């Protein structure tokens, strides 16, 4: 059972790659789609092909940004990290998940260049850029449903029923579980990045621009190991600030308080692995923490604390002054005992390290009344 590897990611993508000239969907030529628009160095659009009235989603990325990001991902064998959007990752993540694990992301249809391997591509793109001939890389996916943010707004002119909330929180945990299993992180969980269907609350994940592999065979970013291990990131700026995890904040402050303005640059020439330790977090635990915030956000109908940094948030510091325990917490005391327990096992680090997602999916609360 193949798990996410960078060799596989690229091989997945090459199968989906073509010149935009030559692409038809149904009978309609690419050139003749009416793309409707949906800061961002990338542009997204919707579109509707008529053969099958099929609604697509289009992300477009300048090849200047592509070419740079690919050289780096190649240097770091897929382990390149930035606070902003990693487009090369998103592409491979999507191509892979589509070929080997349908049903997490919306269906993926093609990657296109618009005016053998991803190196042959870069070669061309680089020759084109050298002649001031810009263009885009286009990622074409199924358009699936509507995000959770939208879903709630629409339905709610009470909030959404506790019954409904639960179905959404459950399917979301399922997705993360299956994603992690496939061998990838998300690291931008939020209502805007989770889609839902009319058809029986059937969900999908969206984006994957903050994604990392979940497994690595390199120690930090240097030494080659003999077998796989969990992946650690030195980029604490992940997703939206509200969902940032505490250990990522600790790292932020570490960089700040030692006057480190460019991490990627500073670490480049650090071999002593004792130092390195101080600027790295576990990615998979980070995902879990985000899902925790998602849960609280969905239950509370809005955040409770605004960042997970006790230096900058009095509320968070109270959360901690009660050992991150929703039952002993003042703002969650009169919530369902069982739900609070569930959430605690996505938040506190002992739990995150120990408690598996497969086991949380079978938690007592998912079967209580109401």
């Amino acid at each position, epitope marked *: 059972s193949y798990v996410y590897n960078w060799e596989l990611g690229q091989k997945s993508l090459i199968k989906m790659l073509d010149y935009a000239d030559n692409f038809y969907f149904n009978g309609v030529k690419y050139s003749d789609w009416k793309l409707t628009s949906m800061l961002k160095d990338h542009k997204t659009y919707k579109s509707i092909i008529n053969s099958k009235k099929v609604k697509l989603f289009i992300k477009k990325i300048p090849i200047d940004i592509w070419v740079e990001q690919f050289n780096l991902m190649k240097k770091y064998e897929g382990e390149y990290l930035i606070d902003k959007e990693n487009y090369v990752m998103e592409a491979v993540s999507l191509a892979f998940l589509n070929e080997y694990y349908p049903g997490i992301t919306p269906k993926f249809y093609k990657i296109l260049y618009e005016s053998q391997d991803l190196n042959e591509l870069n070669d061309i793109l680089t020759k084109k850029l050298e002649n001031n001939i810009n263009g885009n890389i286009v990622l074409i996916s199924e358009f699936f449903g509507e995000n959770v943010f939208d879903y709630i707004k629409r339905k709610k002119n009470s909030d959404i029923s506790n019954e409904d909330k639960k179905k959404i929180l459950y399917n979301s945990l399922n997705l993360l579980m299956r994603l992690h299993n496939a061998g990838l992180t998300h690291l931008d969980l939020s209502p805007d990045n989770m889609l839902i269907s009319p058809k029986n609350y059937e969900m999908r994940l969206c984006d994957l621009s903050q994604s990392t592999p979940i497994y690595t065979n390199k120690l930090r970013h240097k030494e080659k190991l003999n077998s796989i291990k969990p992946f650690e990131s030195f980029e604490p700026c992940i997703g939206k600030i509200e969902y940032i995890p505490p250990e990522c904040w600790k790292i932020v402050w570490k*960089y700040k*308080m030692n*006057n480190i303005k460019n991490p990627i640059e500073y670490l480049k020439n650090i071999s002593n692995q004792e130092e390195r330790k101080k600027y790295y977090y576990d990615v998979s635990c980070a995902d879990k923490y985000m899902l925790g915030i998602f849960f609280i956000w969905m239950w509370n109908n809005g955040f409770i604390w605004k960042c997970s940094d*006790p*230096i900058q948030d009095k509320i968070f*510091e109270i959360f*901690m*002054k009660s050992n991150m325990d929703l039952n002993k917490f003042i703002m969650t005391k009169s919530w369902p005992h069982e739900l609070n327990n569930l959430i605690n096992k996505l938040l506190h680090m002992e739990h995150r390290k120990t408690v598996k997602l497969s086991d949380l999916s079978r938690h007592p609360w998912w079967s209580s009344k109401n």
Partner: nanobody
Framework: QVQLVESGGGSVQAGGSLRLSCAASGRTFSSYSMAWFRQAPGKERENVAVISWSGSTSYYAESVKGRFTISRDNAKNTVYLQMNSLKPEDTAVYYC??????????????????WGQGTQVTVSS
């Protein structure tokens, strides 16, 4: 709504101890994370310490970690910076502060809301 006053500096010898104090006059103390930063005539600002609202969490530049320690008493409205095993390179003007913040982006910087007059600390060789 807060003004800060340092105290308890001086010139010490190498390896000497010193405990800076800081009186907080104004709004309730509970409602501001505190901090200490230093300014050595030659160089640019050095963030030295930050403490949470109640005192749970504290952080330190690696140039003072496990020599200096920042504490606070919220009933007596004070911040301290206990500074031990002092070195020459610790010669600087130290500034008590209020409401530290930063952005998750690394390119940013540590902005305080308030900072008192400062106190000098010189350290012999």
């Amino acid at each position: 709504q807060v003004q800060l006053v340092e105290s308890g500096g001086g010139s010490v010898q190498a390896g000497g101890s010193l405990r800076l104090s800081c009186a907080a006059s104004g709004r309730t103390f509970s409602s501001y994370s505190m901090a200490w930063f230093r300014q050595a005539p030659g160089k640019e600002r050095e963030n030295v310490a930050v403490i949470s609202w109640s005192g749970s969490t504290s952080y330190y530049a690696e140039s003072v970690k496990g020599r200096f320690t920042i504490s606070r008493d919220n009933a007596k409205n004070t911040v301290y910076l206990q500074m031990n095993s002092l070195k020459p390179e610790d010669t600087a003007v130290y500034y008590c502060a209020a409401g530290p913040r930063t952005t998750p982006q690394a390119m940013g910087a540590v902005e305080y809301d308030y900072w008192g007059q400062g106190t000098q600390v010189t350290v012999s060789s």
